[PDB]
Amino acid sequence: PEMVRGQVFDVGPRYTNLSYIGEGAYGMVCSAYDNVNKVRVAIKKISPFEHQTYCQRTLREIKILLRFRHENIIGINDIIRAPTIEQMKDVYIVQDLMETDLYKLLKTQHLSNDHICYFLYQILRGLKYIHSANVLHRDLKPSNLLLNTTCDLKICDFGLARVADPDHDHTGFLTEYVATRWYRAPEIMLNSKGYTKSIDIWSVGCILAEMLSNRPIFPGKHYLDQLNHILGILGSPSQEDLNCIINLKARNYLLSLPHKNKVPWNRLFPNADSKALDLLDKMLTFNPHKRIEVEQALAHPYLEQYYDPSDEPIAEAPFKFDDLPKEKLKELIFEETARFQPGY
Numbered sequence: 001p002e003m004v005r006g007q008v009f010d011v012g013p014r015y016t017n018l019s020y021i022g023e024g025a026y027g028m029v030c031s032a033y034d035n036v037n038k039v040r041v042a043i044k045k046i047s048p049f050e051h052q053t054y055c056q057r058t059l060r061e062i063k064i065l066l067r068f069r070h071e072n073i074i075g076i077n078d079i080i081r082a083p084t085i086e087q088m089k090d091v092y093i094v095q096d097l098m099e100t101d102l103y104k105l106l107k108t109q110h111l112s113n114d115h116i117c118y119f120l121y122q123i124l125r126g127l128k129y130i131h132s133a134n135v136l137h138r139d140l141k142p143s144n145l146l147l148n149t150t151c152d153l154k155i156c157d158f159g160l161a162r163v164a165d166p167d168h169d170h171t172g173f174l175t176e177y178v179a180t181r182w183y184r185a186p187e188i189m190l191n192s193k194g195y196t197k198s199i200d201i202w203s204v205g206c207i208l209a210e211m212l213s214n215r216p217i218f219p220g221k222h223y224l225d226q227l228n229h230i231l232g233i234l235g236s237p238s239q240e241d242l243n244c245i246i247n248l249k250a251r252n253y254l255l256s257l258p259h260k261n262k263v264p265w266n267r268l269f270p271n272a273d274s275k276a277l278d279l280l281d282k283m284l285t286f287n288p289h290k291r292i293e294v295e296q297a298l299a300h301p302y303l304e305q306y307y308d309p310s311d312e313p314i315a316e317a318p319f320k321f322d323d324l325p326k327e328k329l330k331e332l333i334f335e336e337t338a339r340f341q342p343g344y
């Protein structure tokens, strides 16, 4: 086997010419040449068997990726792992190599309104399919949006994804959260576990604001600072939106803050299309129940040039609602990846 840093990357002889790309929420990503299909691919190494939580996430990610089939969601080409459970310590997931991501593009490239409109359409088209499968991505951000040389957009890393569970979304004030800080909806910091579809819509809204200016709209430096950045632009929540927050600690925190008025979108983004700002406003709504849904967002006049509900497919087999030990999860990961084995 070949080494990349100080770690084994056992994908050869089919996959050679390894180069380090980076990391997902977990796992090490490399580019490689597929000697069989004569194309360069991306490969993610996952070593989750020593921990239950890692095993659960690895199992969900693989189950989700294998079940999903959509143009705006990157699929799995192959899975490399040992032929036996005893010999299996690592899992390698193979996907088509995408040229870049929206994070890298936004660092140095100004987006035309046409590119913003097209990227947003593709994000929401992929998201419609994800949400139709009763799945939440939960870590949408520019680095999880891959692009090729013709601007085809594909959503990646379902490492923090979960089956939607709105009945168990309520939690206490200041509950620790796993997903990337800057794209976290205000309710995460107040009373939400991020188990509802509205959590992904907030993240897409943050991505849209970022595509308009090439800078994250809410760059919180720590947990509560993230909420301060959000209220600094949306302004103080209304009495109606506060009445929706039953948790006393979360409500009293918001009531203790000095009153802030709404910063108009047309002042933050003076060169933006007015329809894009109307959609931005509806995605970046404080109250998650009033926040626009993915199908409504696709039907928004800003996306009129692309909107075609018959060419925005939904999932054929949605997921249903776990606490199994890591040894039983290793067996399920082994079973889930069995179809990619040489004998199969």
Ligand SMILES: N#Cc1c(NCCN2CCCCC2)sc(-c2ccnc(Nc3cccc(O)c3)n2)c1-c1cccc(Cl)c1
Residues within 6 Å of the ligand: 021, 022, 023, 024, 025, 027, 029, 042, 043, 044, 074, 093, 094, 095, 096, 097, 098, 099, 100, 101, 103, 143, 144, 146, 156, 157, 158, 159
């Ligand atoms: N998780 C994850 C991934 C990514 N997360 C983002 C990593 N990124 C690295 C650069 C700095 C910001 C964070 S990317 C990824 C993947 C899949 C297909 N093509 C590419 N291409 C790509 C992405 C980034 C840079 C680059 O040179 C190429 N990546 C994957 C991936 C690769 C193989 C299998 C699976 Cl299940 C996922």
